[PDB]
C-alpha cells in the first residue's frame, strides 16, 4: 500500500548486492533452482514440444536437446515454396509491456536459411542480434544468412540479401542489410557480437552494455520483435534479453519493488527452454544489471 521510489529500490538492490556477492555458493544455489523448475516442467510434460519433435523437423533443429515450446514457438505463415512448413526453432519472449518483444532463436542451418528469412520478413523484424561466432570449439556453430561488403547478393528462396554498409566497432559489427522480396526492399540491421564479457572481470561487461544501448538506439520501442540468436538460442540469447529487459524497466522508472534477476529469468525460461544456460551467464546478467543500477545514481 506504501510504494517506494525507483532509486530507493535500486539502493535496496545495491545494499543487498554487497552481501550476496559474498553469500557462499549464493549464485550456484540460485541457478540450481532454475534447473529444478525446468526438470519439473519436463516431468509433468507441462510445455509440449510436439511440433519440434515431428520427424520432418529434426533436420531443422541444431541441437536435439534444445526444443522450442509449442505455445510460444514462432509460426511461419508466409508461403513461397510448396515445401515451406510452419516450423522453426524459435520462440517469442515477452517484453516489459507485452508479448513478442523478442524472438530467441538458434543459429540457422543451411537447411533453415529460407525459414529464417521468412520469419524476419513476416514479422517485420528490424533488428537482428547475433551473439556468437560462426566458428567455436573448433567447429561451425552458425550458417551464413547475411551478406558481406562487395559480395553481391546471397539468395535464399525468393529473398535477396546484400550488404550496403558494415560499421565495425570495438567488440561488434553493424551490417546494414538490404533484403529484396517480390519487388519490395527492406533494411535490416544485424549486430554481430563476436566477444563475450568476462565472468568475473567487471571491466569486460561494458562491451555488452554498449551493444544493447546501440541496438536500442536503432529501435527504442517494441513495435516489432527483436530477433536475438546464438548457436542454440538459449545461453547468450538469454543473457541479452534479461539485461535489455531489466534496462527497459530502468529506462522508464518501473523496477518492481521486489525485482530480482532470478525471477526475471524464471519467467523467461517458461517462454523459451534453457534461457540462460549456465551459472556464469546467470551471474553475468546479475553483474550487468548491478552495473546499470549503479550508473543510475
Amino acid at each position: 500500500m506504501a510504494s517506494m521510489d525507483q532509486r530507493e529500490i535500486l539502493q535496496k538492490f545495491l545494499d543487498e548486492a554487497q552481501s550476496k556477492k559474498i553469500t557462499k555458493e549464493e549464485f550456484a544455489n540460485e541457478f540450481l533452482k532454475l534447473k529444478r523448475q525446468s526438470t519439473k516442467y519436463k516431468a509433468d510434460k507441462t510445455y509440449p514440444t510436439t511440433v519440434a519433435e515431428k520427424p520432418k523437423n529434426i533436420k531443422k533443429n541444431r541441437y536435439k536437446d534444445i526444443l522450442p515450446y509449442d505455445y510460444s514457438r514462432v509460426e511461419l505463415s508466409l508461403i513461397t515454396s510448396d515445401e515451406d512448413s510452419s516450423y522453426i526453432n524459435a520462440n517469442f519472449i515477452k517484453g516489459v509491456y507485452g508479448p513478442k518483444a523478442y524472438i530467441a532463436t538458434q543459429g540457422p542451418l543451411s537447411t533453415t536459411l529460407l525459414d529464417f528469412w521468412r520469419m524476419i520478413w513476416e514479422y517485420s523484424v528490424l533488428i537482428i542480434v547475433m551473439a556468437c561466432m560462426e566458428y567455436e570449439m573448433g567447429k561451425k556453430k552458425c550458417e551464413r544468412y547475411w551478406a558481406e561488403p562487395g559480395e553481391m547478393q546471397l539468395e535464399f528462396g525468393p529473398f535477396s540479401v546484400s550488404c550496403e554498409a558494415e560499421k565495425r566497432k570495438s567488440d561488434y559489427i553493424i551490417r546494414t542489410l538490404k533484403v529484396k522480396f517480390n519487388s519490395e526492399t527492406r533494411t535490416i540491421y544485424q549486430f554481430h557480437y563476436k566477444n563475450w564479457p568476462d565472468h568475473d572481470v567487471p571491466s569486460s561487461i561494458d562491451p555488452i552494455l554498449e551493444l544493447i544501448w546501440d541496438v536500442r538506439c536503432y529501435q527504442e520501442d517494441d513495435s516489432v520483435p527483436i530477433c536475438i540468436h546464438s548457436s542454440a538460442g538459449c545461453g547468450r540469447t538469454g543473457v541479452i534479453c534479461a539485461i535489455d529487459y531489466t534496462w527497459m524497466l530502468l529506462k522508464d522508472g518501473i523496477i518492481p519493488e521486489n525485482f530480482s534477476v532470478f525471477s526475471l529469468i524464471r519467467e523467461m525460461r517458461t517462454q523459451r527452454p534453457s534461457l540462460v544456460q549456465t551459472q556464469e551467464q546467470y551471474e553475468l546478467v546479475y553483474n550487468a544489471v548491478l552495473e546499470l543500477f549503479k550508473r543510475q545514481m
Binding site: 541444431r62 541441437y63 536435439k64 534444445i66 545461453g235 544456460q277
Partner: peptide, 9 residues
C-alpha cells in the same frame, strides 16, 4: 548435427 548443447557443447 543434433548434439546436446548442454553436454559440454
Amino acid at each position: 548435427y543434433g548434439e546436446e548443447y548442454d553436454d559440454l557443447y
